[PDB]
Amino acid sequence: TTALVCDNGSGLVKAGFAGDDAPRAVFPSIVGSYVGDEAQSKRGILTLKYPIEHGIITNWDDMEKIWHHTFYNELRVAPEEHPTLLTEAPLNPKANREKMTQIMFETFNVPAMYVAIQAVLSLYASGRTTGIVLDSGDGVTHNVPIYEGYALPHAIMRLDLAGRDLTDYLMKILTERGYSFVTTAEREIVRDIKEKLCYVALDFENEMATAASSSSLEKSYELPDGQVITIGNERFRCPETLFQPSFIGMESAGIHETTYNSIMKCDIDIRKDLYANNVMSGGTTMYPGIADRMQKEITALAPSTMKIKIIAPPERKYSVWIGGSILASLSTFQQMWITKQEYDEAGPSIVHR
C-alpha cells in the first residue's frame, strides 16, 4: 500500500514508488502493439506514435497501453493496491484531467489517485513553495510562476521548443559540417551526442569567434563503425536555440525572455520572490553552463538592484518525479487523495475538487 508516482512526459515516462529518491522505471513514451523500448527496437515493422504531444495527452488508447506497460511490465505492481499520483502539464484542459481520472479508476481500478502540475512538483523537489520554474523536456518548455503551490494561470508561458527540437537542429548542423544523419538510428545517435558534448556558451558571439580560430572547443564522438565525429561550435550552437529560437525559424523569444515576460505578468509584489527562486527542471535544462547563462540573461533584463538566483539541481532530469515522490509520501497529503468511494459515487468530474 505504497503510493505510485507516474510522471508522463512527451518523450519519457518516469514511474516509481513514492518514497524512493528516483524513479525505478524510465522508458520512451512510445507505442508501436509494443510499448517503450520494445517498440523502439522493432520499429521496422511498426509505426511509432507518441500519445503525449507538447505535454498534452492526445491519444487515449495508446496512453492506456503506456500505463498498462508501466504498472505490469516495468513496475510489476497491482494498481488496485496503490494510491497513484499522476502529473500533468500546466494549463492541461479539464476534459483531459477527467479522462485521466476515469481510466485510473475504471481501467486500472486504483484505490486512490491524484493529479499534480509537473512544474509545481519540481518546485517542491527543491524545497520551495513559491518561485518560478523553467520546465523544459523533450516536447515542450514552460515558464511557471508559482505562489504557495498555486500556478498563476495568467503568467504561465508555453514554448513548443524542447529537446527533440534541439536534436533535429543538431542533426541539421552536423550534416552542414560534413556528416550525414538521416535514418532514425542516426537520430538516436545524434541525440546521444547532444546530451554528451553540448553546452550553453556564456557569450555566444565570442564562443563562435573562439571556435573558428582554434580547436580548443572541439570534442569527438566515435560511432561503432569507426567514424569519429568531431564538433566545435555545433556543441553550443545547438542549445543556443533555447535563447535564440530563430535558429530553427521560430519567432518566439528565448527562454530568458519568456522567464522575464512571465515574471512581468505576475503581481509586482511577487516578482522579487520569483527573481530569487528560478528553479530549472527537465532534461533539456541539463546542458552545462545553462544556469550561468540564465543568471546573466535575467540580470540584463531585470532591475539593476534585483537579486537573481538560478537553482539547477543535479537531479533535475527527474525533478518532477522527485517532487511527486515527496508529495505523495508526506502525511499532510494523505487526506488530499481522491478516493475510489468519491469517484464511485460522484464520477470523473470530482477531480476538480
Binding site: 523537489a125 515522490s325 508529495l327 499532510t332
Partner: peptide, 22 residues
Amino acid sequence: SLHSALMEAIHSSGGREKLRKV
C-alpha cells in the same frame, strides 16, 4: 489549515535527502 501545514511539510521535508536510495 492543512494547506498551510502542507506548505510547512515541503519546507521541512528535507527534499530528496529523506528519500530511500535505489
